[PDB]
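INPUT
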Amino acid sequence: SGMEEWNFPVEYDENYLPPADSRYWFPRRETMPAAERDKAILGRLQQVCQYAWEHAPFYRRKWEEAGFQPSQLKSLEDFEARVPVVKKTDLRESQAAHPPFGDYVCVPNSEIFHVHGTSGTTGRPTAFGIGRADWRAIANAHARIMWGMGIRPGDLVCVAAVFSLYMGSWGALAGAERLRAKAFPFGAGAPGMSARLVQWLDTMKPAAFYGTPSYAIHLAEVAREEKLNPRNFGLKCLFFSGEPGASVPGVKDRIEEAYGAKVYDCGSMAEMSPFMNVAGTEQSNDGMLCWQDIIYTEVCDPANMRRVPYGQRGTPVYTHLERTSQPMIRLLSGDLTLWTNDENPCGRTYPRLPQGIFGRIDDMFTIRGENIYPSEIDAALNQMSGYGGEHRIVITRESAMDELLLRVEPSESVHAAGAAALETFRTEASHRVQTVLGVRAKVELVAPNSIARTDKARRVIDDREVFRALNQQLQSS
Amino acid sequence: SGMEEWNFPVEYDENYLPPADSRYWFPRRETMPAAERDKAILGRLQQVCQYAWEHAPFYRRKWEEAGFQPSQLKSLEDFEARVPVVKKTDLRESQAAHPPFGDYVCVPNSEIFHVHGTSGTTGRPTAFGIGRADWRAIANAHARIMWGMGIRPGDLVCVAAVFSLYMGSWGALAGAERLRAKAFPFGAGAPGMSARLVQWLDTMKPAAFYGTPSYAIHLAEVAREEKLNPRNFGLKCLFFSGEPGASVPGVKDRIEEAYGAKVYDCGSMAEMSPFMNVAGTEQSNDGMLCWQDIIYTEVCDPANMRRVPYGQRGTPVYTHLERTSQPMIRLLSGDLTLWTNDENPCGRTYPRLPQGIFGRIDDMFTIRGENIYPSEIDAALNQMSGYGGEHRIVITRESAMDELLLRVEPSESVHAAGAAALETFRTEASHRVQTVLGVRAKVELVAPNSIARTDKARRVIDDREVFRALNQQLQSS
Ligand SMILES: CC(C)(COP(=O)(O)OP(=O)(O)OC[C@H]1O[C@@H](n2cnc3c(N)ncnc32)[C@H](O)[C@@H]1OP(=O)(O)O)[C@@H](O)C(=O)NCCC(=O)NCCS
Ligand SMILES: CC(C)(COP(=O)(O)OP(=O)(O)OC[C@H]1O[C@@H](n2cnc3c(N)ncnc32)[C@H](O)[C@@H]1OP(=O)(O)O)[C@@H](O)C(=O)NCCC(=O)NCCS
Ligand SMILES: CC(C)(O)C(=O)OP(=O)(O)OC[C@H]1O[C@@H](n2cnc3c(N)ncnc32)[C@H](O)[C@@H]1O
Ligand SMILES: CC(C)(O)C(=O)OP(=O)(O)OC[C@H]1O[C@@H](n2cnc3c(N)ncnc32)[C@H](O)[C@@H]1O
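OUTPUT
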């Protein structure tokens, strides 16, 4: 095949840096005939499915009840048709039965290097247990993809996303470290951090910046209040993940204008680290490329989980080709995208997402880069005695970043107990909701029976102008 | 000497794990006769001074004006008497002239791996540029010291300190990673993080925890409001840095009681990463050991910068023995400590700080693990037109963590312009002070000429009961 350092389990040369003239970090893997890479991906899929069958009782159970065995994997058509999709709810149930990391972890406990996770659910939150070898594989894949964006060794890379449970910032960091770039992990989340960060960007003048697209808009506003020019931060490129925006003109163009630098979209899911497997390149700067030999992406018809033709829309379904810990095999994203397989300006022979990722097959939405499930807001409110049985969700972006508004009904008893009791229920609901979601929601009370009861109810209003036209087009096609 | 992996520049075996029965990660370095290690430290000091002379115009300039050359370094007595101490203000001036990392950086730009830094000063803040090889040296030294605390491979290690500019959390992380412990970088600083963290500690039940001592007290209070038992977090040990507390009975004992686990003190300075060079051990659990072959600590008489005898108090002065990037040679801490050189319960032949570190030779104080210079609060306020020329500083710890209160005079003109103008000056002073300090200060206004003018003024009142007796004893001896 000629594919660079192509084996499972993967074990990249940590000293490899491509020649300075090279556009591609791995010229063969990135430009080889797609049909040839597809033969190699099938070969890999077979090893990964065999590996999961032997080390993941989660997959053995799932595949047995679907009537699938690794011996039945003969083509990519067998892969889409026979292998059932994994849902995030299955992953959550596996961990409830086999904590801390489910019976899909595969690796022994002694191999676990970092513990990360997610927020958003009531009950026990899901944990990520990333093996030592997978951390190196993620670092190596991200450095390759960041090289694709024009980021080079020695470049100062500002990671201005929270360093906590979430894989986003850790992935951009691990990528910067492997690239021999000067990683600058400023982080995020403490009120006051933005005013200090703009001083550090004016002083350090990094070549690259990573965060959420809306945070970069917020930071431009902060730099101006701080009497700083964001055009003088020395930025060559900004790359974002966590939410839609970097492939949306009314978002991307405002960032390119504020900073005078190119913006790159990247990012699938945290369960899919290396999450930059979907990422734009310096020449293919609009939307994202599907880096198929790192993670195998299939854009699927959600009714049958089969690949849609190119030029068509569907839901991304992902498979780890280079992970031994918690490998995801056909994980259903639930997102929507249009994929195409035309000639890319950068020369990479990868499928493309020309407008990035937008929209969902379910009722999930994002608030400041955080996934929000309305069923989870409903479960959190129903755990409260003072809850009056009904609520409404209003999403706005009146300033640079999202605001989540909850209009909650108090019980009649709480309302009768007076203004003090009412205010106590509101603050307790806000505390409970924030602990569950991982983000601050704004909570307001309405009259005890003022909201309509529709016994499934559609409680969410997405009032974000920047996504309105995109939400209407999902209703046209 | 028999000293394990003893060379400069250092290059540790990344695959080395000590035998499971071993108390010491490096038995020879940790238990060898002190006089023999001292001969080796002199040998190292000579290489480090020669290395700085060739690669740091900062040190060449400093030593020339002090009348010192590496050829004059023949004994540890020559080291204390001839080599002038480095002050943090010199480091700040070197960076103003030779940004980004001063002319003490030594390594070429291509070697820089991580950019960190500090807060606390008006103007350009000081940056840390840590080389790739030094990051490995820090990871390796911290894993050795964490092994000394009884932390073992496979142990889940919760790092509940902010992941941003500060070296603290990064150092505990790098240490956990090298130790083959399961690093759990939860982080800190976003309001709401504590309520979620206690859920994660109840669920993940880590063996070890890292943060500030007061944060662990705050977190115990949060676990109780969250209806959780902090005694059921599975903790074996908590290790802290950033502020005094882990060697103070009225602090340490409340933590040991709340969690039912041993507490370890550690931490010198962020400029001195690996900062755990001063750290307690599982058997020498009270106070800290000076791990002399990692960083050379000298407890000095601040009038002449010469070592005080054992049993006496002085200021720690530190020297990097295993750093090529920004190596610190005789950096004056300005802190106070009592050092002793008696037989240690763990068997380590190191000098000991039996009561940790407490007190300063200057007016610096700590607020929630953050260094605060009153001269810097004065400089920040004098940049404001609405400032009335005077203020007072009140430090309290009424709840689990410090509160910094500023009583600020508005100008007569601002006071005459009314309640609106007054409130505008207060909010702007609070914003300016927080941006400078890196921590939220509480700002209250007083009458335009109500504060006494003493043309140097002593504006700070440390009203923290937990440090009162210790502050009085510094006045006795
Ligand atoms: C960052 C985070 C911890 C803040 O918590 P929160 O409830 O949203 O907090 P608030 O809205 O009250 O904002 C607190 C501060 O965090 C900042 N902030 C909010 N969302 C942020 C984000 N996604 N990235 C960076 N900073 C963010 C705010 O601007 C504010 O600081 P400032 O007023 O000094 O500017 C939270 O949004 C989060 O965990 N997001 C994770 C999603 C994510 O970023 N994933 C994608 C990886 S790029
Ligand atoms: C963590 C930090 C960013 C918070 O900023 P701040 O101005 O102090 O913020 P606030 O006092 O308004 O507190 C905001 C939240 O951070 C938490 N917090 C405050 N100081 C903290 C600390 N040192 N460690 C962890 N969390 C901390 C608060 O408890 C609060 O969360 P909660 O109400 O949900 O519990 C700040 O204190 C800091 O940068 N400290 C660095 C010093 C340090 O920790 N160094 C030693 C390494 S161990
Ligand atoms: C991608 C990452 C690691 O930053 C992340 O947020 O992971 P997470 O698993 O928490 O959430 C993934 C979901 O957020 C949304 N999302 C993430 N990145 C993008 C993106 N770049 N564009 C459009 N939506 C995105 C998608 O709906 C996706 O299903
Ligand atoms: C040690 C570290 C990396 O956490 C840190 O805070 O580094 P920094 O350079 O910012 O500040 C060091 C100062 O904080 C105080 N400090 C840090 N750790 C301790 C400690 N363990 N005990 C008593 N004081 C401490 C000392 O006064 C010291 O001078």
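end of record. Chain A touches chain B through 49 residues (CB under 8 Å).
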